[PDB]
Design a protein around this ligand. Structure first.
Ligand SMILES: CC(C)CCC[C@@H](C)[C@H]1CC[C@H]2[C@@H]3CC=C4C[C@@H](O)CC[C@]4(C)[C@H]3CC[C@]12C
Ligand SMILES: CC(C)CCC[C@@H](C)[C@H]1CC[C@H]2[C@@H]3CC=C4C[C@@H](O)CC[C@]4(C)[C@H]3CC[C@]12C
Ligand SMILES: CCCCCCCCCCCCCC
Ligand SMILES: CCCCCCCCCCCCCC
Ligand SMILES: CCCCCCCCCCCCCC
Ligand SMILES: CCCCCCCCCCCCCC
Ligand SMILES: CCCCCCCCCCCC
Ligand SMILES: CCCCCCCCCCCC
Ligand SMILES: CCCCCCCCCCCC
Ligand SMILES: CCCCCCCCCCCC
Ligand SMILES: CCCCCCCCCCCC
Ligand SMILES: CCCCCCCCCCCC
Ligand SMILES: CCCCCCCCCCCC
Ligand SMILES: CCCCCCCCCCCC
Ligand SMILES: CCCCCCCCCC
Ligand SMILES: CCCCCCCCCC
Ligand SMILES: CCCCCCCCCC
Ligand SMILES: CCCCCCCCCC
Ligand SMILES: CCCCCCCCCC
Ligand SMILES: CCCCCCCCCC
Ligand SMILES: CCCCCCCCCC
Ligand SMILES: CCCCCCCCCC
Ligand SMILES: CCCCCCCCCC
Ligand SMILES: CCCCCCCCCC
Ligand SMILES: CCCCCCCCCC
Ligand SMILES: CCCCCCCCCC
Ligand SMILES: CCCCCCCCCC
Ligand SMILES: CCCCCCCCCC
Ligand SMILES: CCCCCCCCCC
Ligand SMILES: CCCCCCCCCC
Ligand SMILES: CCCCCCCCCC
Ligand SMILES: CCCCCCCCCC
Ligand SMILES: CCCCCCCCCC
Ligand SMILES: CCCCCCCCCC
Ligand SMILES: CCCCCCCC
Ligand SMILES: CCCCCCCC
Ligand SMILES: CCCCCCCC
Ligand SMILES: CCCCCCCC
Ligand SMILES: CCCCCCCC
Ligand SMILES: CCCCCCCC
Ligand SMILES: CCCCCCCC
Ligand SMILES: CCCCCCCC
Ligand SMILES: CCCCCCCC
Ligand SMILES: CCCCCCCC
Ligand SMILES: CCCCCCCC
Ligand SMILES: CCCCCCCC
Ligand SMILES: CCCCCCCC
Ligand SMILES: CCCCCCCC
Ligand SMILES: CCCCCCCC
Ligand SMILES: CCCCCCCC
Ligand SMILES: CCCCCCCC
Ligand SMILES: CCCCCCCC
Ligand SMILES: CCCCCCCC
Ligand SMILES: CCCCCCCC
Ligand SMILES: CCCCCCCC
Ligand SMILES: CCCCCCCC
Ligand SMILES: CCCCCCCC
Ligand SMILES: CCCCCCCC
Ligand SMILES: CCCCCCCC
Ligand SMILES: CCCCCCC
Ligand SMILES: CCCCCCC
Ligand SMILES: CCCCCCC
Ligand SMILES: CCCCCCC
Ligand SMILES: [Cl-]
Ligand SMILES: [Cl-]
Lengths: 680, 680
């Protein structure tokens, strides 16, 4: 083994700078930087196409023998859940369920072309559907007057058509906003969605879905709520009118709920013995339709059912832009929430599978999906969190599984929709609630973060509470800001350490940590692992004066008290020699006799104007009582901050900067030795 | 001169830990910490009294011969401006001007006892007065019905009394809120008001005052505005109805404005020849009253005047708590803004005079002043920024100058108020606008910050724009949040440096800076002066792969391409030896041949779970291509973050940590030498 051997002079800043000559920066002109960015080599255009059409990259690289079985199983398992979720979330959007089926077909196909994630399930989302239904009923209330040429027994078809128009308009506007944000590179903000924040946000979204499904589980009529405390209002309303529940709807839904839970437990426990998981949503739906049609519950027990599902696809139709001025705010909110839900879950799966997702491409894909789908009578979509978990956890590899699920939805739309007309809405509710279980499993993060980082546990809990009680829009921005403020908290509560020296080395460690490091007599070394900006500087100065035990104000007060008791451009030197008489020093209380204070700046990333003022004050106050202050390990950035401020207006302070703590200690000891040499 | 000499073994983490034994922490029980905090020694209670009654400290220490002349001159100069400001801001509060005089007397006396700043002028403030007038006219509109037993020629006395009741109620509530915040130690938030933020905020407040004075300068009638864009609305309204201006009011106000400007220029230019500045506000007021009374403008030209000022003080009266539920929101806002204005200017002067102000004591003093003053018919007060500048800049030392100014106000209240009844409101407006000049001088900060720190210039401009276009309440919190987010920006744009070694030393500096430092062959050293948390980790990894020129993905791709071209608990080792055939290596493109990458962690303050995942990925990806990754200079906090996460689940990574960059370089070179020794 070799050894660490260093033999060099003491490196103060002027001494080290004498050995360094400034290098010539290579010319980097902006005009040439733009010119070299427009070469348009074929590889560059191929990379651009891959960026904007990801299917052009991962489809030719499809490992058929390694991906086809997993994609097929995942596609079937995703489709059997996609159908009831589409119907239920269409109900949440105040539109006929067939439009939820449309929203489960076109955007998934488009996302298979434009999307970057290969595990999320694109489709209707409960929170987005709730927002769409809110704007739809605000623009088209239940007591609206329509001169549609019908008798007093109105079938509510015209009201449904008007609400569909409103939903398509808001969907087109939200898609336009999402596409514009993706073009303007707004997706960079996805970097501010940390893992605890994402998981707390998604758990809160799952609670939102569960709350939105309660009225359909119980069969009660409840006013629509959207905004702050909407989850609380919805739960309160459902519990308030729970006395008017449909007992048959609740019984059927609870039977489906229990059977689904049992089947999911069976699948999980026998995963190793089952070649593929049994699709239980298909059996749940079919059995439900059998029970409702066979006993004819729809009017026998007034059980709410899915209703008529017209067959066939609709021709493209232009949404009316005339409603934009009435919906744009909602369109903005839906755009934001849709992005936040899509990029969160995507990240959650990408980190699980060792790849990365482009936020800008996610925004572009969402915008194109929503805007083009609005032409095909599709309301605003997002990522379905529970269905994304199902798709990922059933062996899903690429987005071809989503294409297979969309093919199943298309089969329902074209030929077999009429078979589900008697399916009870309660059954749909139960299915959704059951599939929320995996989402709720994320609560297991609370102990884990409690063991790993209480700051990140705070981020998790704050994000959960915010996204729950406020909306998924206001709660998300609140959580992002608070998570960023945790960094300010970290800087405002740093580790203030007094350093001692490991004998016969140059290693300086916390004096209260290892029992072998010893403080150097006459020298105090103070260290902060944080910047010294405005929110920090006063705490840093107080901590220095408290932890080192060297308070210049206390020293001055003791000097004055001892004096009273014994009674019965040019710059002055920074350190004023203590002209304290020895006769008065006889009454001076004993102390540590510290002549130098070393400030360890190795971990100080930056210093602002307020921090520079604090540092100058520290130097002046300590020099007034005849104590030297040295800065050790100042980075080039910190030295530049000191120079941009008026810290080195007196050039003498250049002598206070040393390369390392050992350099400063050796320089201080050398200064003391020279002072003793010239004393006598 | 001595020399830097170090001779020791290479300090990897296990080697250094072998030399260190954990020290025993001294017992610090919370129960004993509370017990020692309740000793109640006489010095402790004296310090408590000094904290809560600052006058008990600085008054006995009053240097009479050194303070009396400055305090007297400052008191006269402050009072002559305090009278017109009180009248004008009472007009802004929709209350009779005598109540502004009351608000200029009691709170100043109380703040002389409870306040910590010794230079700010306590009294009515234009923004606080505008908020008070807004709530007063909202609760008591101009078209209110009062059965007061009067004829059709109502004198608006009952409406004024009702508005006074509303103002007193909101003042009492705001004072209670301020006192409670001071007790709950909310004043700590004053640490988040940095100097650029404070100066931008105060400049925006000055613009608010100037805007509020315009209608009285021109004599036009304008609807009250309060809230977002209130300054824009007020300026637009004044400019809209400027065609109905009173030409006589504008002429008198402009004459006073010009004479005041000339007098202030004379005072500034002849400060060295004048024993004391000439109080020009007194002459401006007196002359104005002479012109208005002598020519009898009040009805001859319909010039708005101050009006009747009743003599004598009012007995204490309890404000009606019954209005609290109607005003509490406004009371909250007024409490916040009043604090923000008071603690900002206070800090601005404390930093100017080398002392410090307690934010909690400022909150307590403001709350007591407002709550007690509401009993004496005083509406909510704050610090007057322009008058504080006048008081500080005229030789003010303590708050006895404010007491003298209050004595002048009391003299006006008791005996000589009737003399000012004909004083034109336009004159008051002009006086206020003139005294805003010093505030506007703060715009000179823009070039200064442009030269010192563009981040702090951004803070200044953002605070100014926010506090101007939004209110002083919403703009302030927006500015505080954005100023804190500048730290996030700093962490997200750090200095990524490739380090080279200064020959014959252990100094490692940026390779592109000094032309004497040389990169060590086979070794890449990468440094970031920032933490590696979630908002940083991806950028840090990309910057490492880009700046070092060592991209493991590019290496793997080149290896595969060369292979194709040539064709025509136990853990595995972290670094996989490159099993690349030499025959295939003949087609391998030439490279730097880097065997070790050193990550400089000396400036990394903390690392979160996302950053630890990124670091583990970096280590794994570089080891997959047979490249070692070393961490140099990891702090105890960073090592603890790595340990709390599952970074050292494989104990082998403990060997990747080195005390310094030179330690890591020597260890890497030793590893390479040993590998060559065992090769053959
Ligand atoms: C920095 C710390 C204190 C977090 C700040 C969170 C801020 C940005 C949050 C918390 C409460 C939020 C408000 C809560 C409710 C509403 C009403 C809604 O109709 C419009 C948005 C609005 C007005 C929100 C705006 C954003 C808001 C003010
Ligand atoms: C970087 C910073 C600005 C991020 C946080 C900004 C927050 C604090 C700002 C941005 C937008 C602001 C809102 C904009 C408009 C209004 C309406 C007004 O009638 C009450 C205040 C309120 C509701 C503001 C509250 C504060 C607010 C939410
Ligand atoms: C053990 C000392 C640290 C404890 C940290 C606990 C963090 C709890 C955060 C709760 C946030 C709730 C937001 C409403
Ligand atoms: C192990 C972590 C020590 C700190 C625990 C307490 C963390 C509290 C974080 C509060 C952040 C507040 C941001 C507004
Ligand atoms: C020279 C490159 C840096 C320039 C920094 C200029 C900062 C301007 C900030 C403007 C903020 C305005 C808020 C509305
Ligand atoms: C000399 C300073 C270099 C940086 C100049 C540009 C500063 C821009 C700061 C933007 C902060 C944004 C916070 C939301
Ligand atoms: C940045 C997102 C908004 C892009 C502009 C959309 C404006 C609506 C289109 C005009 C229709 C009248
Ligand atoms: C990606 C395919 C987009 C096809 C869009 C066709 C829109 C036709 C509108 C016709 C309106 C009458
Ligand atoms: C997010 C930027 C605005 C989004 C587009 C708004 C379009 C409003 C149209 C109003 C027409 C009168
Ligand atoms: C981002 C491109 C979206 C294209 C969808 C159609 C946009 C125009 C709507 C119809 C206008 C008549
Ligand atoms: C924290 C500031 C508010 C303190 C509580 C004030 C509540 C008003 C007093 C009750 C009057 C009805
Ligand atoms: C600091 C002096 C406070 C005096 C407060 C007296 C309040 C008297 C109220 C009488 C109401 C009729
Ligand atoms: C800032 C905390 C609240 C301030 C005090 C509110 C008092 C409201 C009284 C309502 C009475 C019905
Ligand atoms: C913080 C103490 C303020 C005291 C002022 C009086 C508070 C009570 C108001 C009158 C209630 C009847
Ligand atoms: C606790 C939820 C709110 C109250 C729900 C019960 C309302 C009355 C039911 C009879
Ligand atoms: C689901 C079968 C049981 C519930 C419905 C029948 C009994 C109640 C009728 C109102
Ligand atoms: C596979 C779909 C089976 C649907 C069962 C219910 C059919 C009702 C026919 C009356
Ligand atoms: C993605 C393929 C879309 C095809 C839509 C065809 C609609 C025809 C309606 C008559
Ligand atoms: C990550 C960016 C979050 C932005 C939230 C904006 C909410 C707007 C609600 C209308
Ligand atoms: C896999 C299902 C593909 C779509 C079948 C469409 C059948 C239409 C029958 C009218
Ligand atoms: C609302 C239901 C919450 C269920 C949490 C279950 C956590 C299990 C972790 C093992
Ligand atoms: C709101 C419900 C929270 C329940 C937390 C339980 C965590 C269990 C992890 C084992
Ligand atoms: C080891 C136990 C960790 C518990 C942390 C979760 C607390 C939840 C409070 C809401
Ligand atoms: C609004 C109150 C914010 C309080 C922040 C406390 C931070 C403590 C850092 C030591
Ligand atoms: C530019 C300020 C707003 C317009 C002021 C002029 C309004 C019309 C005056 C005749
Ligand atoms: C200051 C101007 C005095 C003369 C004004 C003449 C015009 C008066 C119009 C009401
Ligand atoms: C010092 C105050 C002088 C006031 C001048 C105006 C007096 C008007 C009397 C009619
Ligand atoms: C600070 C002294 C307050 C004295 C108020 C006296 C009021 C008397 C009214 C008759
Ligand atoms: C420094 C703390 C700023 C808090 C601003 C709160 C504004 C509330 C307006 C009602
Ligand atoms: C310096 C002025 C002190 C107050 C004088 C009060 C005189 C009252 C006369 C009725
Ligand atoms: C609104 C008036 C602004 C005046 C700025 C003057 C700055 C002078 C700096 C020397
Ligand atoms: C809004 C007016 C800004 C004017 C800035 C002028 C700065 C001059 C400093 C010398
Ligand atoms: C040296 C010139 C500095 C100018 C910075 C101020 C720019 C003001 C833009 C609003
Ligand atoms: C809302 C958009 C915020 C953009 C922040 C950009 C920070 C750049 C750091 C490199
Ligand atoms: C190389 C073609 C891949 C599939 C492209 C489909 C049309 C965008
Ligand atoms: C290299 C294969 C390109 C075509 C893939 C299949 C497209 C339908
Ligand atoms: C590795 C893929 C082999 C099969 C190619 C596709 C055959 C349909
Ligand atoms: C989800 C794949 C189809 C169903 C397979 C069931 C195997 C027991
Ligand atoms: C995705 C559900 C498929 C339902 C099929 C019904 C029988 C063709
Ligand atoms: C309330 C209905 C009771 C019968 C169904 C119970 C299902 C577990
Ligand atoms: C093992 C799951 C049992 C579920 C019983 C029914 C719950 C509603
Ligand atoms: C349609 C077949 C689904 C199950 C595939 C795997 C069977 C071993
Ligand atoms: C063997 C599992 C049966 C599950 C049936 C579920 C019907 C809803
Ligand atoms: C799922 C099969 C239900 C059969 C019900 C028959 C009632 C006549
Ligand atoms: C009114 C409830 C707001 C919850 C916000 C939580 C932020 C820590
Ligand atoms: C932990 C820092 C939070 C500061 C927020 C701003 C308070 C005014
Ligand atoms: C030592 C007394 C100073 C003045 C106190 C006045 C009453 C609080
Ligand atoms: C030591 C002087 C105490 C009294 C100061 C004056 C109080 C009116
Ligand atoms: C030395 C004490 C001076 C006290 C001055 C009091 C003036 C009211
Ligand atoms: C240093 C103060 C001397 C004067 C004391 C006060 C005399 C009235
Ligand atoms: C402001 C002190 C009183 C006025 C003095 C004027 C001296 C020319
Ligand atoms: C503060 C202004 C004083 C005005 C005095 C008027 C003549 C006694
Ligand atoms: C508009 C009035 C003009 C006469 C006064 C001018 C003062 C400078
Ligand atoms: C030296 C100041 C001259 C002021 C002239 C009048 C401006 C309105
Ligand atoms: C009342 C006198 C004010 C001026 C004091 C200073 C005179 C030299
Ligand atoms: C010599 C300065 C005279 C200033 C008079 C101001 C009257 C408003
Ligand atoms: C300031 C003196 C004004 C005198 C006006 C006299 C008019 C009769
Ligand atoms: C609507 C104007 C808001 C200005 C805020 C400025 C924040 C940078
Ligand atoms: C969603 C954006 C949060 C604000 C980040 C600002 C960091 C410079
Ligand atoms: C019964 C009250 C419910 C509050 C909201 C829970 C999510
Ligand atoms: C458990 C549900 C039973 C429904 C019976 C309907 C006749
Ligand atoms: C004339 C428009 C004025 C806008 C507000 C300026 C402060
Ligand atoms: C400067 C304007 C003077 C007006 C006098 C009116 C009598
Ligand atoms: Cl979901
Ligand atoms: Cl002011």
């Amino acid at each position: 083994t070799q050894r660490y051997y260093v033999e060099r002079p003491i490196f103060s800043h002027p001494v080290l700078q004498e050995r360094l000559h400034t290098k010539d920066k290579v010319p980097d002109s902006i005009a040439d930087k733009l010119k070299q960015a427009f070469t348009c080599t074929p590889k560059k255009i191929r990379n651009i196409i891959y960026m904007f059409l990801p299917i052009t990259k991962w489809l030719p690289a499809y490992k058929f023998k390694e991906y086809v079985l997993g994609d097929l199983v995942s596609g079937i398992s995703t489709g059997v859940l996609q159908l009831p979720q589409g119907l239920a979330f269409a109900m949440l959007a105040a539109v006929p369920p067939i439009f939820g089926l449309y929203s489960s077909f076109y955007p998934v196909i488009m996302y298979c072309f434009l999307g970057t994630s290969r595990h999320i399930s694109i489709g209707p989302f409960a929170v987005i559907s709730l927002m769409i239904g809110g704007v739809a009923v605000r623009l088209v209330p239940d007591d609206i007057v329509i001169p549609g040429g019908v008798n007093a027994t109105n079938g509510t078809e015209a009201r449904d058509a008007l609400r569909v128009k409103v939903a398509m308009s808001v969907t087109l506007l939200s898609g336009i906003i999402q596409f514009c944000l993706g073009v303007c590179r707004f997706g960079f903000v996805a970097i501010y969605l940390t893992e605890p924040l994402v998981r707390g946000f998604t758990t809160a979204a799952a609670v939102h879905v569960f709350t939105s499904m309660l009225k359909y589980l119980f069969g009660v009529k409840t006013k629509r709520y959207s905004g702050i405390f909407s989850v609380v209002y919805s739960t309160v309303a459902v519990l308030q009118n729970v006395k008017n529940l449909n007992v048959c709807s609740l019984g059927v839904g609870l039977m489906v709920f229990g059977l689904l839970l049992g089947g999911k437990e069976f699948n999980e426990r026998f995963k190793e013995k089952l070649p593929a998981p049994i699709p239980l949503e298909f059996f749940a739906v079919v059995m439900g339709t059998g029970i409702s049609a066979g006993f004819n519950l729809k009017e026998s027990y007034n059980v709410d059912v899915v209703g008529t599902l017209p067959l066939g696809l609709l021709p493209p139709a232009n949404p009316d832009t005339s409603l934009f001025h009435l919906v744009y705010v909602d369109a903005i909110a839906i755009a934001i929430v849709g992005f936040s839900v899509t990029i969160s879950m995507a990240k959650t799966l990408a980190n699980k599978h060792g790849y990365q997702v482009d936020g800008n491409q996610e925004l572009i894909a969402l915008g194109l999906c929503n805007s083009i789908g609005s032409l095909f009578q599709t309301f605003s979509i997002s990522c379905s969190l529970s269905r994304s978990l199902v798709q990922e956890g059933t062996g899903g590899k690429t987005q071809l599984a989503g294409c297979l699920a969309s093919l199943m939805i298309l089969l329902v739309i074209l030929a077999t929709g009429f078979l589900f007309e008697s399916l009870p809405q309660a059954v749909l509710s139960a299915i959704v609630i059951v599939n929320l279980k995996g989402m709720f499993m994320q609560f297991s993060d609370l102990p884990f973060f409690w063991r790993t980082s209480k700051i990140e546990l705070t981020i998790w809990l704050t994000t959960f509470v915010s996204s729950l009680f406020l909306g998924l829009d206001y709660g998300l921005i609140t959580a992002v800001i608070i998570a960023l403020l945790t960094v300010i908290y970290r800087t405002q509560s740093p580790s203030y350490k007094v350093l001692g020296k490991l004998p016969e080395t140059d290693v300086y460690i916390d004096i209260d940590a290892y029992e072998e490091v010893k403080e150097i007599p006459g020298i105090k070394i103070f260290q902060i692992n944080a910047p010294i900006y405005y929110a920090n500087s006063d705490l840093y100065s107080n901590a220095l004066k408290r932890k080192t035990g060297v308070n210049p104000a206390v020293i001055m007060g003791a000097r004055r008290k001892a004096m009273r008791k014994y009674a019965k451009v040019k710059y002055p030197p920074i350190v004023i020699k203590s002209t304290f008489p020895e006769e008065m020093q006889r009454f001076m209380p004993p102390g540590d006799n510290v002549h130098t204070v070393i400030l360890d700046f190795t971990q100080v990333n930056f210093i602002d104007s307020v921090g520079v003022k604090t540092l100058a004050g520290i130097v002046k106050e300590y020099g007034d009582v005849g104590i030297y202050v040295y800065l050790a390990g100042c980075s080039a950035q910190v030295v530049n901050d000191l120079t941009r401020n008026r810290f080195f207006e007196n050039p003498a302070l250049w002598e206070l900067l040393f390369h390392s703590i050992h350099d400063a200690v050796l320089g201080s000891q050398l200064r003391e030795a020279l002072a003793e040499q010239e004393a006598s």
